[PDB]
């Protein structure tokens, strides 16, 4: 029946986030978080292998067959780019494919508050975009980087596994290195990045202690560094970074973070109240002198109280404060807002007042 | 006399849990926990090798002869699936085979309380199914996963060594990866699972620090994660997870567990008082705000007191409370209930209270 | 002169425990702990090599010649089984051989108290048989396992280096794996033993931290686990197990031990007062609720006081209490009892009262 080109076109046309191909099921697309099967016969092992192999190079095929795992990205001219993962289950090939649009949407289209636009103007520091899997983090990062590319005459370097969004040069020089092709690893790229005269660097996830140290060094040496974590809040993000280090070296890490941290964004995507589309809920922490002191004084938990009152001055916003605003504008239902609040009793109190 | 197909048929027909093949003994089938020898001549070394090799591929035969060890699963069309272990003792092949039915029983048939069915509706978090060896853990997990498969339109990924229960697609997309064939290892499968757009993940036993960290990460990144441990209670399960980490990092592990933990099930299978069959005894801990606080404040022991009074509100149940109910229903004898109670004095108090 | 078959027959016939073959000495047999030379010419290097090689397979000969060390067991039909060790000294082969009877003696013949028979009825837990080298530990373990084999319909697995006592099936299924032939190592056997549906497992000596963790896991997962240590008392045994772990993880180990421990037996073999044969002296600790609390409370030393008064209720017995009974029945002399008491002044006090 349908070939890979038609399946990916249907994924794009229907606003799906992921296309799933596996044996004994028809192709399925995730729309607004939920899977929907396409009106097609179920695939067999011949189908899944042929469809997934149709978008691989010969080197990628040999590589997938050596490990039964493969991450990759590819483009279909005139349609979209895609991030693919291919694996093996029950002795057969399976694949998942995520849409990466060629055109980056704006801050207001993505539902990002104006403070996120101001983060794109920071000359230096560490900006963290956090949240659960598939919560819009790469899309937010692409919007920020596109703004920098538009407005600055600086050098942007990204290190990606794989490269997702493409950034053609506007006013910046943008260099994008793909792990496994352009560079051997994140570690090898970071070993030479300081000799490449960067101004803005995207390093991906802060996956281990070595990557955290690289990001802290980048942010301390006069660069604007963007990174991601899978944490769910500003406080949880700061604690996660500090606590990976041995107890005797955590004082320095807290001091470094207090100096270089310029923003923490924690995102989630919620189903809209209408039943179509998803809306962004975001917690924003922008450090002020009080928050930087709390970090140095090892009073990280008290940062949440500072965020509750930093709305007008610094554009800060707790997750519950964002859910409150989404509820008053009727963008989400009460069940969705409550089922997502990190503290439902606090959000209840905010409602009853 | 009998061939492997006939021996596995008797295993299934008799409701046994395991078939044992070893030299100088007839085939034996474990029924309700106790071995029963079949009315057959004892096997010799030729018999044990031939019977076990009849259910192996040539690649599996080569690997078994390379290591004198082998785990595997296989199916017999129209009968059942089986998990097998082949080994060598006294210079001869030996084998044990566990039944894996094609049909997944319901919560009611398995003796699982209604709170277990509500765990299958959880959209995120960490659910732990614990207990001793052969206590029904994989069967409970299959029942929960079959319920999710029936009710949700989500992506379920399992990593198994080997794959036991097979889950055909219902309303979910179900991908099942077998270690050693589909994926190199648990570690390699977990290295890529976040790029496979999952909603529900089965990771197997929390074998080491690395697997615990993977399961905690899965649970906090928006997924429903199922895993097993060989601990015997909810409190012992929480302590086991925290205590594997260095002392300075246990605070973060306790904070993570307090956020993501959605359920701990600890099971044991007991012989029925009727003499035929076994009955499930299960301790259920479902975190409420009080328990999550106790985890963060490093007061894990005080969780047991919360479970004693959380029956009506949250469906919680200590093991002794489950044993009490089984005794009231006359499913088990007093000796069996007392002999398996983790605190016989408490169960005695509960019985002679009124 | 005499061949290996005749030397091993003389070892069996004279009730010896070990036969020694080395150059410039006649064959010597250990009877009741003391060596006695046989009335034969001294052996040379040709003799020792020929005698020891007569009981080796070709693979064992190549193996011994590669390492100058070899542990093994073998049987002589109609006579006995034997555990052998072959080594090299002064450029020549030497060998020691221990008798392993085909018929396992009963509890009363071995001098084991009735509480040891009750340990064979335990459904689950950890049972430790401890004592110095050659103190009867394997023989006690074989008697317990034979009782389980007789009375239960369960699965017994032993891991041995090498297999000593053979256990033909009675009511149990008994599988015995020899390290270096049936299984690669203790570690590899223990890696798969939980997938082999065992009920009772013999794991040998708790030689390292990894083996202790395996035994604690077996005893906690619904199995009856038997293991040995070379400790001399119940308290010394418990302390040895806990103290091998780092200080931060000892709380869990004490908690595990308090849950799974079902018995500690510490044996010694003493020469009989008549001058012929040896008699077993044994310290028995069976945990009661008080002892299990002392383990959790890190009050291990106070367990000895509980054993002094647990004779009638739980069948417990300190080593000195056993020596006291052996002295009143005139089984041992005062010098032997005192020369063996771990606290001679306590045994003195028990005598003068
Ligand atoms: N602000 C947003 N509002 C609504 N939908 C969004 C938003 N941002 C991203 N999405 C959609 O969510 C899906 C995931 O996008 P994206 O890959 O950028 O997030 P992610 O956290 O980086 O995913 P992953 O964890 O796999 O790397 C996409 O389909 C995207 O169109
Ligand atoms: N609720 C139950 N009630 C009665 N019997 C059960 C129940 N659950 C499982 N069993 C039976 O117990 C035996 C073991 O089942 P299962 O393999 O699922 O447990 P397990 O703990 O995962 O075993 P293992 O430790 O080897 O992985 C099977 O024969 C099964 O039919
Ligand atoms: N209860 C007993 N009474 C008298 N003699 C015994 C008793 N048990 C064992 N023996 C004898 O002591 C000798 C050693 O026996 P055994 O090998 O079982 O002890 P062991 O501690 O396991 O030795 P090793 O440390 O070398 O492994 C044998 O000759 C045996 O016959
Ligand atoms: Mg991304
Ligand atoms: Mg299982
Ligand atoms: Mg021994």
C254 torsion bin: left (phi>0), alpha (psi -120 to 50), beta (else): alpha
**H helices, E strands: number in chain C:** 16, 13
Distance B21 CA to ligand 2 centre (A): 20
Written as one string, the DSSP assignment of B112-135 is --HHHHHHTT-SSEEEEEE-STTS
What is the spatial distance between Cα C96 and Cα C293, in angstroms, rounded to a whole number?
45
DSSP class of residue C198 equals -
φ, ψ for residue C152, nearest 5 deg: -110, 155
Q: Which H or E element spans position B263?
A: strand B261-271
Q: Ligand 1: which residue has its CA nearest to atom 9? A: A136
Helix runs in chain C, H state only: 4-13, 45-53, 58-67, 107-110, 114-119, 137-151, 186-192, 209-220, 234-243, 250-260, 289-296, 303-308, 311-314, 319-328, 334-340, 344-352
Using what technique was this structure determined?
X-ray
Beta strand B278-285 with B261-271 is antiparallel
User: Which residue in this structure is represented by tokens 């647990």?
Assistant: C310
CB B213 within 8 A of CB B190: no
Cα dihedral value C213, C218, C222, C224, nearest 10: -120
* Cα dihedral B49, B52, B57, B61 sign: negative
Q: Residue B285 CB: number of other CB atoms within 10 A?
A: 27
Is the dihedral angle over the CA atoms B248, B254, B260, B263 positive or is it negative?
positive
Dihedral class, residue C221 (left if φ above 0, else alpha if ψ from -120 to 50, else beta): alpha
DSSP character at residue C195 = G
List Cα–Cα distances, A50 to A44, B8, B168, B248, B347, in angstroms. 10, 38, 22, 50, 61
Report whether A156 contacts A199 (CB < 8 A).
yes
Determine the Cα–Cα distance for residues A113 and A316; give it in Å rounded to an integer.
Answer: 10
CB C81 within 8 A of CB C74: yes
How far apart (Å, rounded) are the C-alpha atoms in residues B213 and C52?
54
In the three-class reduction of DSSP (H, G, I as helix; E, B as strand; rest coil), residue A102 is classed as coil
User: Which tokens belong to B322?
Assistant: 């489950």
What's the burial of C117, exposed, middle or buried (CB within 10 Å: 0-12/13-18/19+)? middle
- Considering only CB atoms, A230 lies closest to which of B155, B175, B217, namely B217
Edge-to-edge strand list for the sheet holding B155-160: B173-178, B155-160, B200-205, B224-229, B125-130, B261-271, B278-285
| DSSP H or E stretch at residue B166 | none
Pairing of strands A278-285, A261-271: antiparallel
State the DSSP string of A209-241.
HHHHHHHHHHHHTT-EEEEEE--SSHHHHHHHH
Q: Does residue C277 sit at the B interface (CB-CB below 8 Å)?
A: no
Helix, strand, coil in percent for chain C, rounding step 5 = 40, 25, 35
Classified as helix, coil or strand, C157 is: strand
- Measure CA of the first residue to CA of the last residue in chain B; give whole Å: 58
Look up tokens 């070893």; give the residue: B22
Pairwise CA distance, residues B107 & B119, whole Å: 12
CB atoms within 10 A of CB A116: 23
Give how far Cα C225 sits from Cα of B99, C116, C122, C145, C186, Å: 25, 15, 10, 11, 14
Q: Give the tokens for residue C181.
A: 């032939």
Q: Which two tokens stand for residue C335?
A: 């010098």
Cα B138 from Cα C194, distance rounded (Å):
14
Q: How do strand B261-271 and strand B224-229 relate by DSSP bridges? A: unpaired
CA nearest neighbour of C329 among C168, C45, C56, C111: C111
Question: Closest by alpha carbon to A291, among A255, A253, A258?
Answer: A258
**Closest CB to B133 among C173, C221, C255:** C221
Interface contact B184-A18, CB threshold 8 A: no
Residue B140, phi-psi category: left (phi > 0), alpha (psi -120 to 50), beta (remainder): alpha
Residue recorded with tokens 């020694």: C20
How close does chain A come to B21, measured CA to CA in Å?
28
Contact by Cβ (8 Å): A143, A104: yes
Chain B nearest CA to A235, separation (Å): 12
Which residues fall within 8 angstroms of residue C132, CB to CB, at 6 or more apart?
C230, C232, C268
- What does chain B come to in residues? 354
Structure tokens at A91: 């002795």
**Position of tokens 């002795």?**
A91
Query: Across the strands, what pairs with C157?
Result: C175, C201
- Measured CA to CA, the distance from residue C45 to residue C38 in angstroms comes to 18
Decide which of 3.40.430.10, 3.40.190.10, 3.30.310.80, 3.30.450.90 is the CATH code for C1-103: 3.30.450.90
The per-type count for chain A, helices as H runs and strands as E runs, is 16, 13
Q: Helices marked H in A68-136 — which ranges?
A: 107-110, 114-119
What is the domain class of B104-354 according to CATH? Answer: alpha beta
What are the residue boundaries of the structural domains of chain C, listed by start?
Answer: 1-103, 104-353
A157 has which bridge partners?
A: A175, A201
Q: Give every CB contact of residue B326 below 8 A, 6+ residues apart in sequence.
A: B270, B279, B281, B332, B337
Output the six-digit token pair for C152: 């239960």
Instruction: Report the run of H or E that residue A242 belongs to, with start and end.
Output: helix A234-243
d(CA B229, CA B226): 11
A76: its two tokens: 């279909």
Q: Which residues from chain B sit within 8 angstroms of residue C184, using beta carbons?
A: 67-68
Q: How far apart are CA A318 and CA A351, in angstroms?
A: 15
How does strand B173-178 pair with strand B69-76? unpaired
What backbone phi and psi angles, to 5 degrees, belong to A249? Answer: -100, -5
Going by C-alpha positions, the residue among A278, A258, A35, A236 that lies closest to residue A131 is: A236
**Using CA atoms, how far apart are residues A74 and A162, in angstroms rounded to an integer?**
9
Which CATH superfamily hosts domain A104-353? Answer: P-loop containing nucleotide triphosphate hydrolases (3.40.50.300)
CA dist C23 and B8 (Å) reads 58
CB B270 within 8 A of CB B134: no
Q: Which of A35, A88, A239 sits opposite B154 (nearest CB)?
A: A35
Query: What is the DSSP pairing of strand A34-37 with strand B200-205?
Result: unpaired
Coil, strand, or helix at residue C136?
coil
Based on its alpha-carbon atoms, the radius of gyration of chain B, rounded to whole angstroms, reads 21
Q: Cα–Cα distance between A176 and A189 in angstroms, integer?
A: 11
Under DSSP, the state recorded for B68 is S
- In 3D, which of C85, C76, C104 has the Cα closest to residue C12? C76
Residues whose beta carbon lies within 6 Å of some atom of ligand 1? A 17, 98-99, 110-111, 133-139, 269, 278, 280
Residue of B256, B2, B229, B284 whose CA lies nearest to B115? B284
């Amino acid at each position: 029946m349908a070939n890979m080109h038609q399946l990916l076109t249907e994924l794009v046309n229907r606003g799906g986030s992921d296309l799933h191909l596996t044996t004994n099921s028809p192709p399925q697309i995730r729309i607004d978080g939920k899977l929907l099967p396409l009106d097609m016969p179920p695939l067999n092992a011949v189908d899944t292998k042929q469809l997934c192999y149709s978008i691989l190079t010969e080197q990628q095929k040999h590589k997938f067959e050596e490990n039964n795992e493969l991450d990759l990205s590819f483009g279909i001219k005139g349609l979209s780019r895609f991030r693919g993962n291919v694996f093996v289950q029950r002795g057969a090939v399976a694949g998942v494919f995520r849409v990466i649009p060629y055109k980056i949407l704006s801050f207001e289209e993505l539902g990002l508050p104006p403070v996120v636009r101001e983060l794109a103007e920071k000359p230096r520091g560490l900006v963290l975009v956090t949240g659960p899997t598939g919560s819009g983090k790469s899309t937010t990062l692409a919007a920020i980087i596109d703004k920098i590319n538009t407005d600055r005459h600086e050098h942007i370097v990204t290190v990606e596994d794989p490269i997702e969004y493409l950034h053609p040069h506007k006013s910046c020089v943008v260099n994008q290195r793909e792990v496994g092709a352009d560079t051997k690893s994140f570690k090898n790229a970071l070993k030479y990045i300081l000799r490449q005269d960067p101004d803005v660097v995207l390093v991906g996830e802060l996956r281990d202690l070595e990557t955290i140290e690289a990001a802290l060094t980048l942010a301390e040496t006069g660069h604007l560094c963007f990174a991601t974590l899978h944490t769910n809040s500003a406080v949880q993000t700061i604690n996660r970074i500090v606590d990976v280090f041995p107890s005797y070296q955590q004082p320095q890490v807290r001091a470094q973070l207090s100096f270089v941290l310029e923003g923490v964004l924690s995102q989630t995507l919620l189903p809209k109240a209408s039943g179509t589309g998803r809306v962004l809920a975001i917690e924003v922490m922008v450090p002020n002198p009080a928050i930087r002191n709390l970090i140095r004084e090892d009073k990280i938990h008290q940062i949440y109280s500072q965020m509750q009152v930093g709305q007008e001055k610094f554009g800060m916003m707790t997750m519950n404060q964002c859910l409150y605003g989404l509820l008053q504008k009727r963008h989400i239902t009460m069940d969705v807002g409550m089922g997502r609040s990190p503290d439902p009793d606090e959000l209840k109190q905010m409602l009853t007042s």
